[PDB]
Symmetry: C3
Subunit: 151 residues, 3 copies
């Protein structure tokens, strides 16, 4: 079968006076992510992995905003290109806040947006062990991998 | 044909007074990795990729400070336990690939031993396990030798 | 069937005085990448992902007969070794992280070079671009990073 893999990366700065939204979950926090749309770093990384697996370019090609609506439209285009999504895995790298209590809700949001069962979606969290701009809490990064199959 | 992919990331600080252990191999060096267990950044990244591919969460969700089974366990015991939980969930491991990013020391003479260790721990043939090494071209905290990063990718099938 | 995955990473410093070559494409810019070969960070990452999927070690283990060889030559040789190991390449995806210059205009050219070198249909090759949102050495324009993923199948 015609399997394809995709990978994605995103990072945004953390700034005061923005809500913190990751994987579609609003997380109580004194800072939020700054950037394109609601700056949901995890959903953007996943979106890039899916477009990448389908060889449809990247998120900026498609979407010159609720990042869940963008993920759903990404999933629609990937399906229209003839691909079915098989699984998604991902990592969020953040010094803070603690993400564990929110991870299951993120997984559920992604699963809903991709029309996948929960057991085909995974979200992992890491600190950066105090190193670099991530260790200093200046931003949050997300990484994603996706497997799709054509037809 | 129910294939799944997983990806893993880890980084630890390099500190004096600790052995450098990567892929289960003790490498001569004036500093070693600081962290959970023996801070084996490569085995941790692989562990997370495998949990990821099986949609089992992550290393921190499985292995706590609170668990007497894993108190002071080295990263190879954890990797073996990861493999156990992946099998328990109905998955077989097909291959692992990885990259260690370290400005220093030279990892080349140690790579095949790392591969051998991982293959043994995962019950895989050598030809389904790969480890690569990169410097960071003196950029950032990696380039300054403040820490070492590892990245991993894993394919499994249910 | 006998699928395998691979992943690749590369980074090079960005300095005045060298041409900027990414994915085989010369891109007009005041600065260029410094490093192994012609420092094509994207082709190097892809090469590493392919050797990784085939469990053949890494680019430095493979590449004397290669002094002065440019990265497309290296990619092509990589592709040959992957095939002789029994693997057919199914797809490649990748991301370039560069604060500047704008890479979008050059993406099709990169994809075309990579697909040619790998003997792949164009629709099995993808290249994405990201800024680093002004964070870190990448965000300050001190270097450019590439990440790659490759899927292969034995026979
Ligand atoms: N050096 C760079 C860096 C980036 N890009 C492109 O610049 C574009 C920027 N990315 C977005 O627009 C974006 C990210 N997240 C969201 S949600 C709605 C749009 N977006 C992408 O196409 C990149 O390919 C580029 O051409 N060159
Ligand atoms: N911002 C963050 C960052 C991390 N974590 C969680 O924090 C957890 C932490 N990590 C481990 O215990 C760990 C890493 N390596 C080893 S070996 C034995 C345990 N471990 C992970 O579950 C993360 O999901 C979190 O909840 N929020
Ligand atoms: N800490 C490190 C870091 C790297 N390496 C090895 O050092 C080697 C360095 N990488 C290259 O030679 C290289 C990268 N891009 C090109 S084009 C022609 C050669 N190359 C790799 O084999 C790594 O395994 C190592 O042994 N120890
Ligand atoms: K990184
Ligand atoms: Zn984003
Ligand atoms: Zn670790
Ligand atoms: Zn390079």
């Amino acid at each position: 079968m015609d399997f394809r893999i995709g990978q994605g990366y995103d990072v945004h700065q953390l700034v005061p006076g923005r809500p913190l939204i990751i994987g579609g979950v609003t997380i109580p926090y004194e800072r939020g992510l700054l950037g394109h749309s609601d700056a949901d770093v995890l959903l953007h990384a996943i979106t890039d992995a899916l477009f990448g697996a389908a060889a449809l370019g990247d998120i900026g090609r498609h979407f010159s905003a609720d990042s869940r609506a963008l993920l759903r439209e990404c999933a629609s285009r990937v399906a229209q290109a003839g691909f079915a999504i098989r699984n998604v895995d991902s990592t969020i790298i953040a010094q803070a806040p603690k993400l564990a209590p929110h991870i299951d809700a993120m997984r559920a949001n992604i699963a809903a947006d991709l029309d996948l069962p929960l057991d085909r979606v995974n979200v992992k969290a890491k600190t950066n062990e105090k190193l670099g701009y991530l260790g200093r809490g200046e931003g949050i990064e997300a990484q994603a991998a996706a497997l799709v199959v054509r037809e």
